[PDB]
Design an enzyme around this catalytic site. Structure first.
Site, PDB file in Angstrom:
ATOM      1  N   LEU A  86       2.605  -3.247   5.429  1.00 43.82           N
ATOM      2  CA  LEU A  86       2.310  -1.902   4.836  1.00 43.82           C
ATOM      3  C   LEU A  86       2.164  -2.459   3.275  1.00 43.82           C
ATOM      4  CD1 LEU A  86       5.113   0.320   6.105  1.00 43.82           C
ATOM      5  CD2 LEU A  86       2.858   0.738   6.427  1.00 43.82           C
ATOM      6  N   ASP A  87       1.322  -1.556   2.860  1.00 41.11           N
ATOM      7  CA  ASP A  87       1.161  -1.330   1.350  1.00 41.11           C
ATOM      8  C   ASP A  87       2.117  -0.947   0.700  1.00 41.11           C
ATOM      9  OD1 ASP A  87      -1.479  -2.348   1.864  1.00 41.11           O
ATOM     10  OD2 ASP A  87      -2.464  -1.103   0.460  1.00 41.11           O
TER      11      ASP A  87
END
EC number: 5.4.99.-
Lengths: 114, 193, 58, 311, 94
Positions: free
Chosen positions: D33-34
RNA sequence: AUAGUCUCGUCAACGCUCGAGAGGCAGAGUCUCAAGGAGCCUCCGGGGGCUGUUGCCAUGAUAUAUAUGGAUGAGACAGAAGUGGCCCCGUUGACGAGACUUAGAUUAAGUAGG
RNA sequence: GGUGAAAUUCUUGGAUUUAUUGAAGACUAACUACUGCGAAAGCAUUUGCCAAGGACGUUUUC
């Protein structure tokens, strides 16, 4: 180290003590060994440049201490201790000045003044 | 309490010196990058060191930074696959880091000047006897400063004492000591030993 | 924040922007709280959740 | 662990935090995930980190909010533009809600990465003509597990570890932590005898005598999971015969271990104990078979006809 | 006299002529172990160990000539390092 | 001998958000920002409303700054310090290193001897 | 009052004792000490200001 010699001459023109100048040079250069640059080496470099101190460093520090205790006596005249040790340090600096006059580092024409 | 106050003052002075050093460093490397972009060619480290020394002697401010840029515009200072491309860019970044290390070495050469500037700034912010040197005749004594620094203090004291080099003594004794100490055989033996 | 949700009848989330749904249920915030590894407040949270039986597995 | 990632740090930092809290020897994750994106994260602990490589390429489902720069003249055409952009990268999408006065639209989509959601928002704004950008992003499903399948926060992990350290209760840790076999639900199962479990853990190819049960629908060179009668997972394997071939033949190799999940000596070593195995051992000792076990000249033809080496 | 001392406890309550201390250190003292002050001067012996695992307290029985009211909050009490036991020793074995 | 499994470090190829910084996260210190003020009206010295889709602070982020957010926060010191506090893309194939096996999966009442 | 016993003095105008007020000079009760400091003399109330030191280490334009 011509730039180091120029910086040392510039610091000597600022009226810094030779021990203080050597300490500042060691701090600036990061000298881990104090045997590489010493006060005797600083004095030799100053003599090579052509600068010699007018008064000895120890005599100058003794004169500064005498001036400080004289200022204290001017502030407080009721004290006997500072007056007694002022008499003692004047005796000490008179003996050291006689030794310097015999050694001729201090010119014999100059006389210590109370 | 006095020790705590002295420690706080020393910490504040160190922080001010660090801030001044990093400001001088980042403005200097920005100016160097701008000069490299304008000239279009690589700049020698000796020329960068000379420019840094000139800027340190000039006591550069923002207007003096513009003046230094103008002096760089003068002819004297102007004369002075994909993975492989990424590796070449990394090598160029390493060369820029080496230039920054040279700039840091130049700032360490002017560390006394930087400390003097920081002390002057502190005195300006605060807004608030003497030891004299007499003139003496210079004698190089056949030894350079680097040669003196390459020898121990005990050997230098044994070779020539401070009392033998007394400035306020007679000139005849100094001349005799200089003549006795300037023997080529003794100097050659000292250099070989 | 903008992403809000309510728990559905079957136990699944339903997302909306609206703070209050049509039925009148107050929506919750879909985004969890910030975390730090140097969080020194595990004891207080466990104690307060144990007072009301909100610890999972209790 | 099914975890709700906060919106300040990245996935790798969260995994490294979990490794510090639980004092693991190794911690991994499959989907990244960013830092700004929040949502579902699957955290694998120690032996579960063997499944991470098998967890690559799984389906991801996101819920996103797009902010429009200008108010729209036509509402439902937005959904049409969403239908213009789904498919041939976003596979399926659905517009949950839109507010034109707030200029904000929340929608669910099936995607592969969080950057494609930003690209989808930019393309939606460009195709509309009013312009748009991503407001918020959330992953509501990563891999097999979803956000409704016992998702916990990092506060839950810290509190559970504190409870076990100080109170010595294990129920909260057992609540927050799921077995690794939750990642293996969709696989086709083959049940192994307890004598053959240790041999499979040592890298031996599973054969007919080790087989107890086989799931219907197994095809040639198919991903399977080898399980025991207690339900725990031995290994992820490649099937070597189909279901009808499993029912038909009496000798053969049924699986080859792709990734061994079980510890080596969890079960005792019971190979070499059998009729054919001890017969081969006795003939090897006597000299009918050679030292390696291949066919020799002193070997009788009856054993050559009855027994064939699978290797 | 002990060779070395470690920070054992912090003063909490003077109740019934005995010193209650929060255990700053993370290991459990011996019963009747001598408790010292940092000039290695014996103030008393450990009388009781109590409190949960997260917050361990101990009660020092003061020696004769020492009064519990004489101490104040934030005082530290020291113990020789030989008189300690690991916390996992008292925990049940796996 | 052959083959497999586990734990690793290098190369090549292929894709992707294109990968070690003046970076990010977590933490400590100082400072700034919350319509806490001002003026109008009112109802019973106090209370309510308005100026106030205002003002203060942050952000050009694929970007409407007449905008978007503001304590369930943001910015400066800080291009610093620190990391011996953490993080910085995956797949396939080959090579090299330490190992464990080379496994056809037994037993409807036991083991060892005379 | 004081002495071994005494004695000189003070006063029913109030000696002596007790309580309060005002002024003056002096001192810092216990901890407290031929093991601290200072050349000696001598030196422990709180709060600041000033100057100088002792022992230790690094050394010295020595």
């Amino acid at each position: 180290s011509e730039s180091v010699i120029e910086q040392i001459v510039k610091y000597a023109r600022k009226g810094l003590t030779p021990s203080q100048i050597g300490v500042l040079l060691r701090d600036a250069h990061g000298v881990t060994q104090a045997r590489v640059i010493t006060g005797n080496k600083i004095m030799r470099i100053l003599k090579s440049n052509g600068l010699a101190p007018e008064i000895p460093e120890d005599l100058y520090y003794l004169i500064k201490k005498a001036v400080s205790v004289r200022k204290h006596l001017e502030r407080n005249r009721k004290d006997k201790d500072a007056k007694f040790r002022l008499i003692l340090i004047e005796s000490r600096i008179h003996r050291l000045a006689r030794y310097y006059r015999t050694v001729a580092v201090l010119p014999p024409n100059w006389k210590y003044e109370s | 309490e006095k020790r705590k106050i002295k420690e706080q003052i020393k910490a504040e002075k160190e922080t001010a010196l660090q801030k001044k050093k990093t400001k001088k460093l980042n403005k200097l490397t920005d100016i160097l990058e701008q000069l490299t972009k304008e000239y279009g060619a690589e700049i020698n480290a000796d020329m960068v060191k000379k420019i840094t020394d000139t800027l340190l002697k000039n006591d550069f401010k923002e207007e003096e930074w513009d003046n230094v840029v103008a002096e760089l515009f003068n002819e004297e200072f102007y004369q002075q696959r994909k993975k492989s491309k990424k590796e070449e860019k990394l090598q160029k970044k390493k060369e820029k880091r080496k230039v920054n290390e040279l700039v840091e070495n130049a700032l360490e050469q002017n560390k006394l000047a930087l400390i003097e500037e920081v002390e002057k700034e502190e005195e300006e912010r605060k807004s608030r006897l003497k030891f004299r040197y007499r003139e003496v005749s210079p004698e190089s004594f056949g030894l350079t400063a680097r040669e003196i620094f390459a020898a121990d203090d005990t050997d230098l004291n044994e070779f020539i004492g401070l009392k033998k080099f007394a400035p306020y003594r007679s000139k005849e004794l100094r001349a005799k000591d200089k003549r006795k100490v300037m023997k080529a055989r003794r100097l050659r033996e000292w250099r070989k030993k | 924040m903008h992403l809000m949700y309510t728990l559905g009848p079957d136990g699944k989330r339903i997302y909306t922007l609206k703070k209050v749904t049509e039925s009148g249920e107050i929506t919750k915030s879909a985004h969890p709280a910030r975390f730090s590894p140097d969080d020194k407040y595990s004891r207080q949270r466990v104690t307060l959740k144990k007072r009301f039986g909100l610890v999972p597995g209790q | 662990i099914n975890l709700d990632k906060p919106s300040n740090p990245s996935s790798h930092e969260v995994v490294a935090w979990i490794k510090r809290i639980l004092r693991c020897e190794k911690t991994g994750h499959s989907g990244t995930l960013d830092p700004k994106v929040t949502g579902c994260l699957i955290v694998c602990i120690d032996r579960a980190t063997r499944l991470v490589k098998s967890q690559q390429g799984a389906g991801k489902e996101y819920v996103c909010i797009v902010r429009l720069h200008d108010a729209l003249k036509d509402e439902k055409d937005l959904g049409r533009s969403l239908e213009n952009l789904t498919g041939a990268t976003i596979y399926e999408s659905n517009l949950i809600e839109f507010d034109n006065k707030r200029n904000l639209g929340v929608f669910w989509a099936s995607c592969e990465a969080g950057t494609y959601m930003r690209t989808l928002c930019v393309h939606l704004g460009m195709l509309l003509g009013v312009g748009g950008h991503m407001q918020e992003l959330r992953r509501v499903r990563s891999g097999a597990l979803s956000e409704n399948d016992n998702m916990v926060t990092l506060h839950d992990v810290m509190d559970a570890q504190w409870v076990y350290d100080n109170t010595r209760d294990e129920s909260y840790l057992r609540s927050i932590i799921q077995p690794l076999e939750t990642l293996l639900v969709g696989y086709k199962r083959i049940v192994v005898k307890d004598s053959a479990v240790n041999a499979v853990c040592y890298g031996a190819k599973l054969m007919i005598p080790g087989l107890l049960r086989y799931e219907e629908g197994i095809e040639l060179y198919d991903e399977i999971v080898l399980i025991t009668t207690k339900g725990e997972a031995i290994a992820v394997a490649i099937a070597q015969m189909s279901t009808v071939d499993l029912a038909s033949c009496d000798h053969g190799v049924v699986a080859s271990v792709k990734r061994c999940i079980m510890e080596r000596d969890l079960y005792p070593r019971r190979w070499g104990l059998g009729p054919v195995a001890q017969k081969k051992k006795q003939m090897k000792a006597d000299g009918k078979l050679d030292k390696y076990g291949r066919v020799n000249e002193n070997t009788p033809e009856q054993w050559k006809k009855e027994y064939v080496p699978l290797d | 006299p002990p060779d070395t001392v470690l920070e054992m406890g912090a003063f909490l309550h003077p109740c019934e002529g005995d010193i209650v201390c929060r255990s700053i250190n993370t290991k459990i003292p011996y019963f009747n172990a001598p408790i010292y002050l940092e000039n290695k001067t014996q103030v008393g012996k450990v009388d009781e160990i109590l409190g949960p695992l997260n917050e361990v307290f101990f009660t020092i029985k003061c020696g004769d000539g020492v009064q519990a009211t004489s101490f104040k909050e934030g005082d530290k009490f020291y113990i020789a390092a030989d008189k300690l036991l690991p916390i996992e020793r008292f925990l049940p074995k796996p």
